[PDB]
Amino acid sequence: MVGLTTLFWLGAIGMLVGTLAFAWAGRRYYVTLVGISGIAAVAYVVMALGVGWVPVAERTVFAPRYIDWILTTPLIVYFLGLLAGLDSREFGIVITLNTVVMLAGFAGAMVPGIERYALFGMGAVAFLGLVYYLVGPMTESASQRSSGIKSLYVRLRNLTVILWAIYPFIWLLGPPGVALLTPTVDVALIVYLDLVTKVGFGFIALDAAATL
Ligand SMILES: CCCCCCCC/C=C/CCCCCCCCOC(=O)[C@H](O)CO
Ligand SMILES: CCCCCCCC/C=C\CCCCCCCCOC(=O)[C@H](O)CO
Ligand SMILES: CCCCCCCC/C=C\CCCCCCCCOC(=O)[C@H](O)CO
Ligand SMILES: CCCCCCCC/C=C\CCCCCCCCOC(=O)[C@H](O)CO
Ligand SMILES: *C/C=C(C)/C=C/C=C(C)/C=C/C1=C(C)CCCC1(C)C
Ligand SMILES: CCCCCCCCO[C@@H]1O[C@H](CO)[C@@H](O)[C@H](O)[C@H]1O
Ligand SMILES: CCCCCCCCO[C@@H]1O[C@H](CO)[C@@H](O)[C@H](O)[C@H]1O
Ligand SMILES: CCCCCCCCO[C@@H]1O[C@H](CO)[C@@H](O)[C@H](O)[C@H]1O
Ligand SMILES: CCCCCCCCO[C@@H]1O[C@H](CO)[C@@H](O)[C@H](O)[C@H]1O
Ligand SMILES: CCCCCCCCO[C@@H]1O[C@H](CO)[C@@H](O)[C@H](O)[C@H]1O
Ligand SMILES: CCCCCCCCO[C@@H]1O[C@H](CO)[C@H](O)[C@@H](O)[C@H]1O
Ligand SMILES: CCCCCCCCO[C@@H]1O[C@H](CO)[C@H](O)[C@@H](O)[C@H]1O
Ligand SMILES: [Cl-]
C-alpha cells in the first residue's frame, strides 16, 4: 500500500515546501536554511526516481541520503554556530567532528563485512564529542548574546541533540546494521526525522525572527 518510492516523494515534497518558504522569508541565516532543505529536496527526488539504490551484500543502501547528510548537517551546525557567536576556529572543530560522523556512516553503510560496525563505532565516538561542544562550549558562547538569541539557540540545540541522537539507533536497527527493522519502516522513520531536523528546525527559526 505504501512503497519506498512513495515515501521518498513525500520527503521530496516536504523539503520543497520548506525550501520555498525559507526563500520567500528571505526575499546568511535564510540562505543557509534554503541550502539545508534545498539539497535534501534534490536527494529525495533522485531517490524517488530510483537513482542511487546501491546493492551491498544482502541489503540496499541509499547513496543520495549520505551525500545529503554530508552537505546539509554541517550547514545545520553552521547555523547554530552563528547563533552562538563562534570564532572561526571553534567552527573548524565542530564541523570537522561532524564530517567524521557523516563519513564514517557513509563508509560503514557501503562496506559488506563486519568492519562496517567498526566504522559505525568511530562515528559514534565523534558524535559524543560533537554533543559535548553543542551542550558546553557553544552554549557558553551563546550566553554572551541577547536573551532572545540565547533562547533561540537553546531551543534549536535541544531539538538538534535529542533528534540527532536517534539516527544512530535507527541505522543500527535497520538494514545497514542488524537488519531488524524492514527497509520500509526504517525509511519512513528517517523521512520523518529528516523533515523535522531540517524543515521543523527552519520554521522554529522563522517563528522567532518575527517575535523580535
Ligand atoms: C556545503 C557545506 C559546506 C561545509 C562542508 C564541509 C566539508 C564537507 C565534506 C565533503 C566531502 C564529502 C565527499 C562526498 C563523497 C562522494 C562519494 C560519491 O560516490 C558515490 O557516488 C557512491 O559511492 C555511489 O555508491
Ligand atoms: C512578508 C509577508 C510574507 C507572508 C507569507 C507569504 C508566503 C507566500 C510565499 C510563499 C509560500 C510558500 C509555501 C509553499 C506553498 C506551495 C504549496 C503548493 O502546493 C503543493 O505543495 C503541491 O500540491 C505539491 O508541491
Ligand atoms: C568557518 C566559517 C566559514 C563560513 C563557511 C560558510 C559555509 C556556508 C555558506 C553559505 C551557505 C550555502 C547555501 C547553498 C545554497 C545552494 C543550495 C541550492 O539547493 C538546490 O539544489 C536548489 O535550491 C534546488 O531547488
Ligand atoms: C576552518 C574550517 C575548516 C574545515 C575543515 C574540515 C576538514 C575535515 C575533512 C576531512 C576529515 C576526514 C576524517 C577521515 C575519517 C573518515 C572515515 C572514513 O574514511 C575511511 O575509512 C578510509 O579513508 C576509507 O578507505
Ligand atoms: C538532515 C539530516 C540529518 C540531521 C541527519 C543526521 C544524521 C545523524 C546524526 C547520523 C549519525 C550517525 C551516527 C552518530 C553514527 C554513524 C551512523 C550515523 C551517520 C547514522
Ligand atoms: C536572499 C533571498 C532569499 C534567499 C536566496 C537563496 C539563494 C539560493 O538560491 C535559491 O534557490 C531556490 C530554488 O532552488 C529559490 O527558491 C530561491 O529563490 C533562490 O534564491
Ligand atoms: C542578490 C540576491 C542574492 C541572493 C542570495 C545569494 C545567492 C547565492 O547563490 C548561491 O551561491 C553558491 C556559492 O556559494 C552557489 O553554489 C549556488 O549555486 C548559488 O545559488
Ligand atoms: C538542480 C538540478 C540538479 C540535478 C542533479 C541530478 C543528479 C542525478 O543524476 C543522476 O546521476 C546518475 C549517475 O550515475 C545517473 O545514472 C542518472 O541517470 C542521473 O539522473
Ligand atoms: C543507469 C542507472 C539508472 C539511472 C537512470 C535511469 C533513470 C530512470 O528514471 C527516470 O529518470 C528520469 C530523469 O529525468 C525521470 O525524468 C523519469 O521520470 C524516470 O522514469
Ligand atoms: C567490497 C569492499 C568494500 C567496498 C568499498 C567500501 C567503501 C569505502 O570507501 C568509502 O568511499 C567513499 C570515498 O570518499 C566514502 O564513502 C568514504 O570516505 C570511504 O570510506
Ligand atoms: C545532490 C545529492 C544527490 C546526489 C545523488 C547521486 C547518487 C548517484 O549514485 C549513483 O546512482 C546510479 C544508480 O542508479 C549508479 O549506477 C550508482 O553506481 C551510484 O553511484
Ligand atoms: C508516514 C507513513 C507511515 C507508514 C509507516 C510504515 C508502515 C508500512 O509498513 C509496511 O511494511 C511492510 C514491510 O515491513 C510492507 O512491505 C510495506 O508495504 C508497508 O506496508
Ligand atoms: Cl541506507
Author numbering: 1 to 27, 35 to 219
What does the paper say about this structure?
Bacteriorhodopsin (bR) from Halobacterium salinarum and sensory rhodopsin II from Natronomonas pharaonis (NpSRII) are intensively studied model systems which provide insight into how light is utilized for energy transduction or phototaxis, respectively. As with all microbial rhodopsins, both contain a buried retinal molecule that is covalently bound through a protonated Schiff base (SB) to a conserved lysine residue of helix G (Lys205 for NpSRII and Lys216 for bR). To understand how light-sensing in archaea is initiated by sensory rhodopsins, we perform serial synchrotron X-ray crystallography (SSX) studies of light induced conformational changes in sensory rhodopsin II (NpSRII) from the archaea Natronomonas pharaonis, both collecting time-resolved SSX data and collecting SSX data during continuous illumination.
X-ray diffraction data were then combined into sets corresponding to eight 30 ms time-windows, of which five (from 0 to 150 ms) were judged to have sufficiently high population of the photoactive state for further structural analysis. By representing difference Fourier electron density throughout a three-dimensional structure as a one-dimensional mapping onto the protein sequence, we observed that structural changes from 0 ms to 120 ms are highly-correlated and have internal Pearson correlation coefficients from 51% –71% and that this correlation drops to as low as 13% as the signal-to-noise falls on longer time-scale. The time-scale of this loss of correlation implies that photoactivated NpSRII microcrystals were swept out of the X-ray beam ~120 ms after photoactivation. By contrast, difference density features associated with helix G are weaker, yet are relatively constant until ∆t ≥ 120 ms, which is the time-scale when the photoactivated sample is swept from the X-ray beam position. In our SSX structure we modelled several n-Octyl-β-D-glucopyranoside (BOG) and Monoolein (MPG) molecules in similar positions to those previously observed.
